[model samples]
Target: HISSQQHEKAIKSYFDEAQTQGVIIIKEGKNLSTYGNALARANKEYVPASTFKMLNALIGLENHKATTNEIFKWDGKKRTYPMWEKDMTLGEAMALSAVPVYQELARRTGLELMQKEVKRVNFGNTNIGTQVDNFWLVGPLKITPVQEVNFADDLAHNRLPFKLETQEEVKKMLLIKEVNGSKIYAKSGWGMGVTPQVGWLTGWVEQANGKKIPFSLNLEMKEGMSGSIRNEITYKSLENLGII
Candidate 1:
């Protein structure tokens, strides 16, 4: 087993090597471990960007705005990412982080219901702003890394306020990969819609022994940096801590 001191040292080294400012919070049951000014940074709210998709999916499903198998037809308009240019199911959109599709889901959910659901869940500041589609992307909807972990932990344990089936369906959409009977369910977000872009990776690892370890990480994106680096640093930190 890795000592807490060693874990903090390893986490700090990984972030230093990445040359970015960030915070990570990992939860093993009720105990929390962190690095990179985790207490301060984790509590600082930031635009959730695509990470909001997890909650969006849940709200969409619960409100019957869309089903897991429902297909979202692409508008054929040019997009920042070529991968999001085609029609996709809700699950596919979530995996690809297709902004347009989730935006549509938000539109369908409408601002009134969206705001209601967000407040009901007590997510972050619970402010969806005036617009339905762009609130989470821009403002005034924001969530801290610590809030991300809390939401994810609730989802992982089927403890969210939404219907159990709705929560389960959304959880299924977050599955990234599995190795050695351990599965990692995560979502990555790039808050390009906000000034001082933020990158996020949030989810949990289901260990082979049946323990679920939930974590959330967000970093300041230096110019020209790829959002993919969020995963690189997070996985390395998890590995160094012997959690993966």
Candidate 2:
């Protein structure tokens, strides 16, 4: 139903108004409906940016390197985003997409164990290279929009290859908001180190009826474009589909 003619037209108009190219993949059970040049971009791999936080949190929890409530003391040094310049719990860092906090978690998680878990999870490309903190944000770790949805779908169903409790805990941290009878769990990522930049919004929507709809959106961000558009287009698309 998500790929109906009317839905495609509405989704296309949203992308057109934004004047950027990207893809949104919405999965309902085994069916996947896509819009915005889905054929060319949905399967194309790119740096995961902070969307990897979903998995990074999982790995940290599983290894006991970090806890959802553990405080990540901030250094007084200035950083890119002012919101990240203060002490915060792992959950808070995740909500704010604080890069340095997660990077610290990555350093503590260690490359050996990180590699083992990344391979076990079968994440995109599954290559952490030699860097401990910046791989996901920079390069050598990539995931397509389709893979992002699949990963989110598995986590939404509590079926990832990790301890049940670990997955459960990460899910709680990812909850962004609840409206009506539905809950939205998501994370946004901006790969600013790459040319043209890439912005991501990946997560799932749990309907009142207990159905899970997982979606991933990534767009070619141009110069001077704010990262907020990722969420704007995604929310509008989901709302147009009546899934929000």
Candidate 3:
């Protein structure tokens, strides 16, 4: 188990200084984060937002539905987000956080299979409800921050129920940045839905020594808030843990 006094302190400082409502949880092997307040909130469920894609990619690949290179065809619907207009690979969609591509993927995936997989993985609540496509985005599908950490823990350890190959491929899609000493693999999500808009940055860090740190964050956000609020805080939290 890996424990960090600095990590817990960093989380507290981020929450207090930012003057926002958010929760974060991190795990390194058997050690759990010590920020009890964040931990408490982390245990509560919320809409998964685009963090669902992490699972969507896994289930999509596991069921032989899409290959990493296969460009998902656009439905000819123009989105306010210009990047959603063109065809894109799973890799591209993950990198861009393109929602439409994934929604289509979910629709093609259908409700039954998505429901089973979500339950199989024991995602928070696992109540995909009636929607095949919109469940994770706006419907009843929900997950907690602690659950996100648990998912990342399995992902990093290759302990997820999916095939190791599928996990590895999804992991590859998640890689956002890499430098000499560490690699950051994460997904950022912002959901504007009926309940409340939320922003998320969820994933893990792999150090040069092969040490892995798994973390998840959720924040209450305004409808039009920039995604930057999600990214900077998570990155600084990692740095505060001395993950540099």
Prediction RMSDs, each to the true structure: 1.3, 1.6, 2.7
What TM-score would each prediction reach against the true structure?
0.96, 0.95, 0.91
For model 3, the superposed segments whose C-alpha errors exceed 4 Å read: 1-10, 34-39
Task: Tell me the tens digit of each residue's lDDT in model 1 across 10-34.
Answer: 7877777778888889998987766
lDDT digits (tens) for residues 1-244 of candidate 3: 4465656666777766665678777787887673522456776778888888999999999998888889888888778788888989988999988888888778878889999988998988889988788888886988878888888888888899999999999999998877568998899877777466777888899999999998888877765566786777787777766775
Residue pairs with backbone overlap in model 2:
none
In angstroms, give how far residue 92 of model 2 lies from its true place: 0.2
Candidate 2: tens digits of C-alpha lDDT, residues 71-166: 999999999888989999878888898989889999999999999999999999999999988999888898899999899899999989989999
Residue 212, candidate 3: how far off, in angstroms?
1.0
Clashing pairs in 1: none
Model 3 lDDT at residue 24: 71
Task: Give the whole-model CA lDDT for all candidates, comma-separated.
Answer: 0.88, 0.88, 0.81
